[PDB]
Each structure stands twice: as C-alpha cells, then as structure tokens.
C-alpha cells in the first residue's frame, strides 16, 4: 500500500451499487440483538456512523452486550480475540 490509513483499498467494499444508493431503510438500523446471537459484519456504505474498521467487513461475531446504542461484538482476527463496537445498521442476523 502507498499509504496506511483505515480506508486504504476500500474503494469497493465501502461503495454502493448505483441502485442501492441513498439513505438506507431505518428498519435494520433499529434492529435489536441479544447477547449470544451471531451477527455478520458489513458496513452499509450509506450509513456514516456506527462503523468498524473495514478490515473486519465479512466477519461473523457474537453479540456480547452493548455500549450506548452500539453493540459490542466479539470476533477473532486470525488467531487474536477482538471486541468490535458497532451499530445495528451494519449488522445482520446469521441464518
């Protein structure tokens, strides 16, 4: 990489297909999850806040409590355990 900022090489993953462009539906930004639930991490290009580091796009973690309205999701980066602060807007129920 020519630089090392968080958004380095995120042109694709943080861009919407032309038709999914524009404010996203509120339903999924208000979704409620319970501790223990499995959630898929995926930033919604249209929603600025509640994001996590792009490197974790695609992960599937375990909700374990929350902080404010945001959720605390536990994932395992390679072999390291990490806790991610993320809002519902960027989460989806597994299965």
């Amino acid at each position: 990489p020519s630089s090392n900022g968080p958004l380095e090489g995120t042109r694709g993953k943080l861009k919407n297909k032309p038709r999914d462009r524009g404010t996203s539906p509120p339903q999924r930004a208000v979704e409620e999850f319970d501790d223990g639930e499995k959630v898929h991490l995926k930033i919604d290009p249209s929603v600025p806040n509640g994001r996590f580091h792009p490197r974790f796009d695609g992960q599937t973690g375990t909700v374990e409590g929350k902080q404010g309205d945001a959720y605390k999701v536990d994932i395992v980066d390679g072999g390291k355990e990490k806790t991610i602060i993320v809002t519902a807007a960027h989460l989806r129920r597994q299965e």
């Binding site: 038709r19 524009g22 509120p26 339903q27």
Partner: protein, 186 residues
Amino acid sequence: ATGPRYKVPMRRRREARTDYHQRLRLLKSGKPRLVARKSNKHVRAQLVTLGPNGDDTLASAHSSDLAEYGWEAPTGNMPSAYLTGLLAGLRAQEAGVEEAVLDIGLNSPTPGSKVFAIQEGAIDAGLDIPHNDDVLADWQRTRGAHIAEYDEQLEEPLYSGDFDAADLPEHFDELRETLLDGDIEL
C-alpha cells in the same frame, strides 16, 4: 426509470407519505409511536409499535367513531382532535400501553395545532409522552371556544343545519366527561 443505474426512491417516499429521516429519529426512543394524522373531515390517532413485517397498531381512535359516544358535531376541529386523542389513549391504556412519542408525520409543529391537541388528549388519557405544555392550545380553544365566538359574528349559522346555531364547547365537556369512566370499547 431511465436506465440500470437509475435510483428509484423507496415507495413511501415516492408517495410522499413517509419522512424516513424523521422516522428513524422517532424509532430511536424504542417507545411506541402516537401517530397523529388528519383529513379534511376527520382526525386519526394510532399507537404503533415496530414489527417483523411492518408496524403493528395496538390501539387507535378515529374522529368518526366519536359519535358512537354522543358526538353530534363536525369532526375536523380542535375539540374533535383532543377527544380522538383521549379515546385512543384510553384504548391504549387498556391494551397495556404506558408511554409513546408523538409522530406527526408530514404535518407542521405549529403551536396550538390539532396534532398537539391529539397529543394533549392521549396524555390526559394516562399515556406518558414527551411533550411541551406551551406549544399546546390554551384549553378554551381545545374546548372549541374559538369557533363559538366565531359564530357570534353570526348573521348566518356557521353550521349548515348540523346541531345548534351558536355551537357548543359544552358538548365538548359532556363528551370528555363521558370518556373518563366506564363505557364500552375503553
């Protein structure tokens, strides 16, 4: 419409019926919404909750089924709104609903407006709702006084046949009084 890349608004935005930015803010509270809506002739009040396939209305009141309790006056006015709010609020209470946030859809937050009257009613019914007292009408106007005085400048009945010639803010009291005890569907 024009091509593959074209962006078509969400249906309720096309229909110019739902303000999604306000909606999200509303849903933040995590509380039920007190949906205050108006029509040229009527005023509706619903207590809506969030659902898997769409909203769920747990209690509602329409200015039309107000007569069902002794309403013999027009239904597109202030006194009408308040009562419809109180009615819906009561049914709300019966349903086990204790609090809600006021959703006035695409209407304007004008002081003394009917939506706020609806809000006042629901609150008095027992519903706990975030509000601001000096944005509401001064009781008398809610009673329908502004209209009675307007008919004082008579010369010709404000009401085409309807009921009374000089109107009745008293009819208002009789009804509120009624709603505050017993009766069916409450």
